[PDB]
Amino acid sequence: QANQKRITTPYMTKYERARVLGTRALQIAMCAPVMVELEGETDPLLIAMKELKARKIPIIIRRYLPDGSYEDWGVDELIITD
């Protein structure tokens, strides 16, 4: 759909933030570039959780509306619940 007229919650559902911090931590865990300055972090889940609060994660979420269409929200445009 167009960037106008998107109808979906701007907030990030707890299902999306569970699969974003999982998919991001799996990338970091394989030699993937890190967007944020890491300080004493050897653990990928803590790094990926840190990228999220800074809104640095490079993922766009594709939300399928139930009628077959879809919308593309980048992880910056969404509003982190917690």
Binding site: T8, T9, Y11, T13, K14, Y15, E16, R63, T81
Partner: protein, 41 residues
């Protein structure tokens, strides 16, 4: 005056956190919540 402006600030945030999350499996929730008491009835 500032309490009221601060009060309307959280009535929004507290509400917008209640809204159901797209993707919840609801039938799993309503099937288990009606039948979980059943074991004690």
């Amino acid at each position: 005056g500032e309490a009221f402006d601060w009060l309307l600030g959280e009535i929004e945030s507290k509400f917008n956190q209640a809204i159901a999350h797209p993707g919840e499996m609801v039938g799993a929730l309503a099937a288990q919540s009606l039948g979980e008491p059943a074991t004690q009835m």
